[PDB]
Design a protein around this ligand. Structure first.
Ligand SMILES: *[C@@H]1O[C@H](CO)[C@@H](O)[C@H](O)[C@H]1O[C@H]1C[C@](C)(N)[C@@H](O)[C@H](C)O1
Ligand SMILES: *[C@@H]1O[C@H](CO)[C@@H](O)[C@H](O)[C@H]1O[C@H]1C[C@](C)(N)[C@@H](O)[C@H](C)O1
Ligand SMILES: *[C@H]1C[C@](C)(N)[C@@H](O)[C@H](C)O1
Ligand SMILES: *[C@H]1C[C@](C)(N)[C@@H](O)[C@H](C)O1
Lengths: 7, 5, 7, 5
């Protein structure tokens, strides 16, 4: 990952 | 709820 | 809020 | 490391 969300 | 990374 | 990120 | 919310 390395990003986030939330999807 | 709470997808992600 | 209520969502995410990271901005 | 986590601008968000
Ligand atoms: C989400 O980010 C905000 C802003 O930095 C933090 O205050 C919060 O701790 C963080 O939420 C964490 C903990 C949680 C709400 N239980 C999880 O659902 C979330 C994905 O991560
Ligand atoms: C998501 O990132 C925020 C900012 O660093 C943290 O506060 C939060 O603990 C983190 O959420 C945790 C728990 C999770 C949502 N189930 C995991 O997918 C995530 C990587 O770590
Ligand atoms: C993160 C927060 C959110 C956008 N309200 C939720 O729908 C998602 C799945 O988790
Ligand atoms: C969350 C993770 C990220 C997208 N790599 C970073 O740039 C942001 C500020 O925090």
């Amino acid at each position: 990952x390395x990003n986030x969300x939330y999807x | 709820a709470x997808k992600x990374x």
